[PDB]
Design a protein around this ligand. Structure first.
Ligand SMILES: *[C@@H]1O[C@H](CO)[C@@H](O[C@@H]2O[C@H](CO)[C@@H](O)[C@H](O)[C@H]2NC(C)=O)[C@H](O)[C@H]1NC(C)=O
Length: 246
């Protein structure tokens, strides 16, 4: 497992947890120097367990699919909560097996669904480390509408930051203060599958992508990523979703 404690959390222990997360995820190869997530993993080995501790010392256990970095569910005391989706239900045969009770949230785990549930687009919701603390806190007692808003923070602060160095940097900047995500952060989160796929297709095409990716990179600029020499590729993107899962 991987852990993180908000009490005494600075941009540094956060960098250490994010490094630790990416490192817990299996891969056999590197594509242009970026780890390539497995196509599949069978059994319980398919799920990573993340322990998050709020400022006060309370925790939740977050279940993660090692294949795509999608959050499956979480445990808060003796209750497990899972998204209403097949992968999460199958995830439930392998983890939080001793929870006294299991609740299925009234929504699946994609941004679109979580945003309808919360009543706000993630562009209008602040993230940072304080926001992570609040989210842990709120997932500790059930409220489906509020949980949706806390899942939107948690997902960006763990999964999205492990996928992109730019996003992990954004969070370290919001370590003592929250702030809505930039235009650029949203764009990256949304093109990960797109980009993951174009990097894979570029092998054998001289690093040239078959279909250009439109991104917004810092300062609000509307850019097109055409090949592997681009900065998003060489520096940013830290994990690639296998094309067999796109
Ligand atoms: C691969 O990547 C770089 C950018 O990361 C591209 O270079 C641009 O190419 C266009 C068209 O020829 C120029 O007008 C730009 O000013 C170049 N920018 C930089 C920063 O180099 C490169 O074109 C891409 N490779 C190919 C084969 O197109």
């Amino acid at each position: 497992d991987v852990s993180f404690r908000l009490s005494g959390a600075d941009p540094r222990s956060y960098g250490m947890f994010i490094k630790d997360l990416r490192n817990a995820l299996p891969f056999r190869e590197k594509v242009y120097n970026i780890p390539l997530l497995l196509p599949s993993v069978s059994g319980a080995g398919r799920y990573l367990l993340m322990h998050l501790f709020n400022y006060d010392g309370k925790t939740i256990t977050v279940a993660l699919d090692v294949t795509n970095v999608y959050i499956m569910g979480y445990l808060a005391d003796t209750t497990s909560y899972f998204f209403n989706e097949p992968a999460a239900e199958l995830a439930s045969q392998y983890v939080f097996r001793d929870a006294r009770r299991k609740i299925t949230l009234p929504y699946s785990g994609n941004y679109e669904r979580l945003q309808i549930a919360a009543g706000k687009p993630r562009e209008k919701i602040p993230i940072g480390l304080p926001a992570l603390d609040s989210a842990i806190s709120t997932l500790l007692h059930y409220d489906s509408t509020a949980a949706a808003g806390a899942l939107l923070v948690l997902i960006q602060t763990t999964a999205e930051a492990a996928r992109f160095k730019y996003i992990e940097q954004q969070i370290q900047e919001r370590a003592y203060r929250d702030e809505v995500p930039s235009l650029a952060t949203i764009s990256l989160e949304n093109s990960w599958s797109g980009l993951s796929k174009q990097i894979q297709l570029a092998q054998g095409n001289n690093g040239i992508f078959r279909t250009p990716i439109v991104l917004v990179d810092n300062k609000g600029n509307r850019v097109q990523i055409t090949n592997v020499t681009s900065k998003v590729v060489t520096s940013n993107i830290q994990l690639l979703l296998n094309t067999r899962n796109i």
